[PDB]
């Protein structure tokens, strides 16, 4: 037994284990970008997504 870290893109990722049917897992964005009418560090969210 151990642990493994797998990066997942926005598109989607497949996942297999054991001898049973696999499960597909994708991801989205959750960084704190949008402001609330006050000065904010929005850039960080836009930095978390597409550093380019």
């Amino acid at each position: 037994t151990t642990s493994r870290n797998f990066s997942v893109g926005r598109e989607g990722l497949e996942y297999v284990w054991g001898n049973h049917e696999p499960v597909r897992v994708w991801a989205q964005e959750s960084a704190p970008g949008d402001p609330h009418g006050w000065p904010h560090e929005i850039i960080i969210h836009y930095y978390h997504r597409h550093p380019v």
């Binding site: 989607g12 990722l13 994708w26 989205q28 959750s30 402001p35 929005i42």
Partner: protein, 438 residues
């Protein structure tokens, strides 16, 4: 009526569209890709499997002579020796210092278990697609299946709907492949009649039980040993077992776009990529005259709440006034966001709540109910959970994630000093003339 529209390749993602005709309510058309079926063109080259050698009873001439004949057996070989004294339990069968001669021969054939352990080399080409669609128009459902080629319309209710060609061709299959026990391995096998000892495909056959067979695996006979009749032989290990130990992983775990691949058709399924155009013909009977459809009045758009997410996490509210009862479809004329439901019961002055999703947190767009439409602007937030495999990105991003606040900061940011520069130049010219006055 007739219409056309392009849809991305993806399974189980209903798309809702509208057909607009003056005097007729705009029908809501629902399009779903039930499944995909990519079937290429295949050619069988030859079979292979573990081989069993043959060591036939030797041809021994007691005090005479022999020779090394020829035969059609695969890997057939012969070799002769002289001055041999073979022995056996009853004693020595024959001894003649020079006149004795021994002749041995060797060949090979597919092992009996091959019948089920056999693998096959396939030449593939010209990937072709077959697509199953479910199309609903005015609570009129239809299940159809057709090729993506622009010529053939699939038959469903005798409604000919054309689609394709594919926007971009994708094929995980290499021109050469191998198949074994329900698995497909991408490999570059050698040509028929081309063999190498210790290499894959050392033995070939047009059929699993074809009498004709050919191979080459470096079988050189060995001289007889001391005093005991036998046939010492030599040959290189089967390339089948070697390739098995190092065949590499199956294509099932390496194909892009999550292809599901099966062998007996040698096809892929539920593998999504690209976009497809579609042409759709519709009977005018399915269409409904506008007067028959209800009319609406002074409808307002109200966003109860919306969090940017992957599922139908956006919620909206609508207040409407109508002079008629019945049903109307709803649509999001802006691509960035898409609803989840098509229509609902109407009322003289009732109001409804709607689900939807979007590719941007900026909920600024227009949405149509019956034939009329109203604008809807708001801000949605990113979610906490960020890992899910359920349908998502139903709409691709269009660099519209840029918030209105960011646009506000950018607009007031970019300078316009060039206008000040031009004013400075003009006043410079006027002052230069004034100086020229002197």
């Amino acid at each position: 009526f007739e219409h056309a529209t392009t849809v991305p390749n993806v399974p189980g993602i209903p798309y809702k569209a509208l057909v607009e005709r003056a005097g007729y309510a705009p029908l809501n058309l629902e399009i779903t890709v039930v499944s995909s079926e990519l079937t290429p063109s295949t050619n069988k080259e030859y079979v292979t499997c573990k081989f069993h050698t043959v060591v036939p009873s030797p041809q021994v001439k007691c005090c005479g002579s022999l020779e090394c004949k020829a035969s059609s057996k695969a890997d057939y070989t012969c070799r002769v020796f002289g001055g041999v004294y073979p022995f056996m339990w009853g004693g020595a069968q024959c001894f003649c210092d020079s006149e004795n001669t021994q002749l041995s021969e060797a060949y090979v054939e597919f092992a009996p278990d091959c019948t089920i352990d056999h693998a096959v080399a396939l030449k593939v080409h010209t990937a072709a697609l077959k697509v199953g669609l479910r199309i609903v128009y005015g609570n009129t459902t239809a299940r159809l299946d057709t090729f993506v080629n622009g010529v053939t319309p699939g038959s469903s209710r005798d409604l000919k709907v054309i689609a394709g060609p594919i926007s971009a061709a994708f094929s995980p299959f290499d021109h050469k492949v191998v198949i074994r026990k329900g698995l497909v391995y991408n490999y570059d096998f050698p040509e028929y009649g081309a063999m190498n000892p210790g290499a894959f495909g050392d033995i070939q056959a047009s059929s699993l039980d074809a009498t004709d067979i050919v191979a080459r695996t470096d079988i050189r006979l060995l001289k007889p040993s001391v005093k005991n009749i036998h046939v010492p032989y030599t040959q290189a290990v089967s390339g089948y077992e070697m390739w098995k130990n190092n065949s590499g992983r199956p294509l099932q775990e390496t194909a892009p776009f999550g292809c599901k691949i099966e062998v007996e058709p040698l096809r892929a399924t539920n593998c999504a990529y690209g976009h497809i155009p579609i042409s759709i013909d519709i009977p005018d009977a399915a269409f409904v005259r506008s007067s028959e459809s209800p009319t609406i009045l002074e409808v307002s758009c109200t966003v109860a709440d919306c969090i940017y997410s992957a599922d139908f996490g956006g919620s909206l509210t609508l207040q409407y006034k109508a002079n008629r009862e019945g049903h109307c479809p709803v649509h999001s004329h802006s691509t960035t966001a898409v609803l989840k439901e098509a229509t609902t019961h109407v009322t003289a002055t009732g109001s409804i709540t709607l689900h939807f999703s979007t590719s941007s947190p900026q909920a600024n767009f227009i949405v149509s109910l019956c034939g009329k439409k109203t604008t809807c602007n708001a801000e949605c937030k990113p979610p906490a959970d960020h890992i899910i495999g359920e349908p998502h990105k139903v709409d691709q991003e269009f660099q519209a994630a840029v918030s209105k606040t960011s646009w506000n900061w950018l607009l007031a940011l970019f300078g316009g000093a060039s206008s000040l520069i031009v004013v400075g130049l003009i006043v410079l010219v006027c002052s230069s003339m004034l100086i020229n006055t002197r």
